[PDB]
Amino acid sequence: SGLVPRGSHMSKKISGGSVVEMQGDEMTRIIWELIKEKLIFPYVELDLHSYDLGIENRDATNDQVTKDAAEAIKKHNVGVKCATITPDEKRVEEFKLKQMWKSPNGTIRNILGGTVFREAIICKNIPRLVSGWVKPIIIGQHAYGDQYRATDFVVPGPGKVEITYTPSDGTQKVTYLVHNFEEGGGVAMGMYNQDKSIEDFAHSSFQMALSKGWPLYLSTKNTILKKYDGRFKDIFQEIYDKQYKSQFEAQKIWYEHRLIDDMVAQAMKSEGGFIWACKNYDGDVQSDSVAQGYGSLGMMTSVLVCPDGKTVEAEAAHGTVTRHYRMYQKGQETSTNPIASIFAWTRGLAHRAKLDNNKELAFFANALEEVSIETIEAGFMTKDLAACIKGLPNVQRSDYLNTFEFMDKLGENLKIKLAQA
Amino acid sequence: SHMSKKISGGSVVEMQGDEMTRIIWELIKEKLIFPYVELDLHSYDLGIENRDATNDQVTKDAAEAIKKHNVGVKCATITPDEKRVEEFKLKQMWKSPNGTIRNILGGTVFREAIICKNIPRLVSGWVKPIIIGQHAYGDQYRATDFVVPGPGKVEITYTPSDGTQKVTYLVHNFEEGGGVAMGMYNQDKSIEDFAHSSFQMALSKGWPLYLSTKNTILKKYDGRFKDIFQEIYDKQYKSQFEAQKIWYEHRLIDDMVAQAMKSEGGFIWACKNYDGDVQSDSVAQGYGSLGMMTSVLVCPDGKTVEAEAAHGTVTRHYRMYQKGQETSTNPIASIFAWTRGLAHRAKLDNNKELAFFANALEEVSIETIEAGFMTKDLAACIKGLPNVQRSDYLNTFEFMDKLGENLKIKLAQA
Ligand SMILES: NC(=O)C1=CN([C@@H]2O[C@H](COP(=O)(O)OP(=O)(O)OC[C@H]3O[C@@H](n4cnc5c(N)ncnc54)[C@H](OP(=O)(O)O)[C@@H]3O)[C@@H](O)[C@H]2O)C=C[C@H]1[PH](CCC(=O)O)(CCC(=O)O)CCC(=O)O
Ligand SMILES: NC(=O)C1=CN([C@@H]2O[C@H](COP(=O)(O)OP(=O)(O)OC[C@H]3O[C@@H](n4cnc5c(N)ncnc54)[C@H](OP(=O)(O)O)[C@@H]3O)[C@@H](O)[C@H]2O)C=C[C@H]1[PH](CCC(=O)O)(CCC(=O)O)CCC(=O)O
Ligand SMILES: [Ca+2]
Ligand SMILES: [Ca+2]
Ligand SMILES: [Cl-]
Ligand SMILES: [Cl-]
């Protein structure tokens, strides 16, 4: 039967190393398991550290699992996160929650720190809503502080709201009048940010612009918040003058501070092709406008780059697609776009491979991104993208693939691509 | 024999401004308003020179004058920064006149694009206008902010006036370096006025109303906006809305921004102060031209209005003008400031002729531009800035003069 041992038909899976996975809710959870089953695990073996951030396990552990996941990301340097339920009043009723738990993304970000870089996932055949955006716009959202770690409260009636700083060294405290309510009640809030966090934010922004060869703009409202936003402006400018200016000049680019009002108009009018450093809230809100302006709200990458220069968390930024989940729970067909979740996995695994000098893993991660884009541009897509192209009322069943058909088509094309290489 | 009589005008609080907008303001009065309308103008000079001279008192005096006369029109003004401070040798870096007038008067700033058929939008589907109603009081614009110079505790406290024990909310314990911190507030009555003005504007335009907040994150602060609007709607407006086949909904700011991008327009968008400030720039630009916007502060008394030009004082054109070089400065926003004010004056005085005039001036502006006579910025909207030749646009004086010729023709025909 032949003295020479013939080669195996099954080929050796890639050693991918250590990865923290944050499991999610509803249809995104369904998608997440399909991605692992059909796209990752046949080709990559992982030392996978899985945390269930589904709403029921967050409730059971009093949100401790979210903290545990963040600490694990510190330890292993790579996290990949599925979309999760951020509960409102209805979710409190539906799950009999102990509390209207806060957004886990905010908790993870306030623990890890850094900058969330957000960018559209561009398909040649998905039309833009903004005509001129022929190059990408990359938002760098400062991931720490401000509204997302504030303390807000109802003022029940007349009285003084004051804000006080008490120096740790025992020198005199300073007290500022926020407002004397003399005619009724209202609301008040305190919020803050940290110098070191702002410095990390500036560093990540300058470095991303220099890595791309694109100009950088930071938006603030320092005309109104002269101290608070002026601190962002000053720290960026001093870091630019100290370390990065000659690097920008050598690449013929620039960094400029802009008022947020001007910056959103300028962005809308632009051709794309720049980095936009945003304070936490502005990056949160403006990335929705950028995501929708490129064609599809969900076709975004979202990667938290932590201040240590080694740790990354990639996530799907859209929601858990509740209506599709309900259909799926009744055995009905859905057409759920998995691209954002797939790219969470590929961006995470690409950083894993960079940390590990894993050439096989890096080739794989890029190959999966290529397969996803090429599949869509070849005309095989989920219903939402079909509607981007034709308009929802004109979509017919042959224009799109359902959730399982689309995953299977990606799996076929990934197998072809890895075979050809 | 009867003399040629100007249209009765009434009492208008004028606030004069700075730089190129001051120049075009005088041009508008001279060529478009004064030859046809006779005004009882109460003029306040909010030029940065007089604001430094009076220690910003003139701004407050103008705001009170508006309280008195119910109709105010405002030119663009310099909001000084460090550069302005050194340039004019200012005593202080005074706050923006707008912020002061708004804190004094209260109300909601309604902003909306001025649409010309030949000016292409940047957002494909916006075939109907989007009207933003920006709450004009509180939040960031009245906040107390400071630099935290080193390790220490920041807390924000509430002390009831009636003696009941205070409550202290920890903001942050800075253990390593320093940072920044800030308190801000809003008032129930001002939010209720905001809601009432939003519901009324929606009913008058016959469009649905969305309010945006971030109450996912700010459950108490933004929760109050949401709760107040929902209660005032259920109790006082839902039936009228349903009668006009419109509706009111709360939306998260993230959702609202994306859906507006993807929508057809045709709705009222109630915004917290900061969001209205920022999103209206985004909307203005998305319709084609950032400066083609009306901006009208509607005060809670339901009678007092302040119309302004929202854009800046066009400093580069002013420098050209100073050196006797021609400029192409678009005066439409300042014109519509005047016409919106005059239309409110006509409404208050039941002045048929003045209302006819204000609408006519708006029509003449739009038709002039749509007939192909425009300033350089709109030419560039059409052809793209690199492709604009001198023959594609009119300079500031030529455009003003063409508007005057067309306004004379329009008023004569009727
Ligand atoms: N990451 C996360 O963790 C998120 C969790 N959620 C949780 O998802 C749950 C529901 O969320 P909805 O908002 O109701 O939306 P949906 O996902 O149900 O989709 C609505 C309709 O659109 C269509 N459709 C959408 N995705 C599709 C897909 N893949 N394929 C195909 N069709 C798709 C489809 O339409 P048809 O039904 O007609 O086919 C579908 O029904 C609730 O529990 C939310 O809390 C929401 C968003 C983020 P996000 C954090 C962002 C950040 O951290 O930066 C804000 C997003 C933003 O800012 O833009 C939460 C806010 C916070 O945490 O503060
Ligand atoms: N309302 C006001 O009173 C404002 C006053 N200012 C004060 O104006 C001063 C300068 O301002 P810049 O920011 O440098 O801009 P610019 O006006 O000089 O134009 C820059 C370039 O664009 C082009 N161009 C613009 N307008 C054109 C026009 N008509 N025709 C033709 N081409 C035109 C042209 O381009 P070329 O040169 O290539 O031809 C030109 O050079 C500074 O001193 C500022 O303080 C700024 C804006 C508002 P704003 C209140 C908004 C609100 O309350 O609703 C925030 C802006 C926003 O939110 O949208 C600040 C005050 C506050 O904080 O309250
Ligand atoms: Ca967002
Ligand atoms: Ca603005
Ligand atoms: Cl299916
Ligand atoms: Cl001229």
Numbering used by the authors:
A (entry chain B): -8 to 412
B (entry chain A): -1 to 412
Question: What text does the study give?
Answer:
IDH1 is a highly conserved, homodimeric enzyme that reversibly converts isocitrate (ICT) to α-ketoglutarate (αKG) through NADP+-dependent oxidative decarboxylation. Tumor-driving IDH1 mutants catalyze a NADPH-dependent conversion of αKG to the oncometabolite D-2-hydroxyglutarate (D2HG), while typically ablating the conventional reaction. D2HG competitively inhibits αKG-dependent enzymes like TET2 and JmjC lysine demethylases, causing DNA and histone hypermethylation and cellular de-differentiation. We identified one mutant, R132Q, that maintained weak conventional catalytic activity, drove robust D2HG production, and was resistant to mutant IDH1 inhibitors via a mechanism not yet understood.
In addition to the NADP-αKG adduct, we encountered an NADP-tris(2-carboxyethyl)phosphine (NADP-TCEP) adduct when attempting to crystallize ICT-bound R132Q. There may be catalytic relevance to these adducts since the TCEP and αKG carboxylates helped coordinate Ca2+ and maintained many hydrogen bonds in their respective active sites, though the metal ion was slightly shifted to accommodate these adducts. All TCEP and αKG adducts appeared as hybrids between the semi-closed, αKG-bound and fully closed, ICT-bound R132Q complexes. Here, unlike the planar ring observed in our non-adducted forms of NADP(H) (R132Q:NADP(H):ICT:Ca2+), both the αKG- and TCEP-containing NADP-adducts showed a more puckered nicotinamide ring, suggestive of a transition-state-like conformation. To better understand how these adducts were forming, we performed density functional theory (DFT) calculations for model NADP-TCEP and NADP-αKG adducts, which suggested that adduct formation would not occur if not for the constraining environment of the crystal structure. If the NADP-TCEP adduct could form in the R132Q active site, it would act as a competitive inhibitor. Dose-dependent inhibition of R132Q catalysis was profound with TCEP, while DTT and BME had minimal effects. Determining that the NADP-TCEP adduct was competitive with ICT was unsurprising as the TCEP portion of the adduct mimicked features of ICT binding to R132Q. While DTT has some similar structural features compared to ICT, it does not recapitulate the carboxylates that the TCEP and αKG adducts contain. These adducts preserved many polar contacts that non-adducted NADP(H) and ICT form with Ca2+ and active site residues. Further supportive of this adduct being distinct to R132Q, and thus perhaps formed with the help of this enzyme, TCEP was much less effective at inhibiting WT.
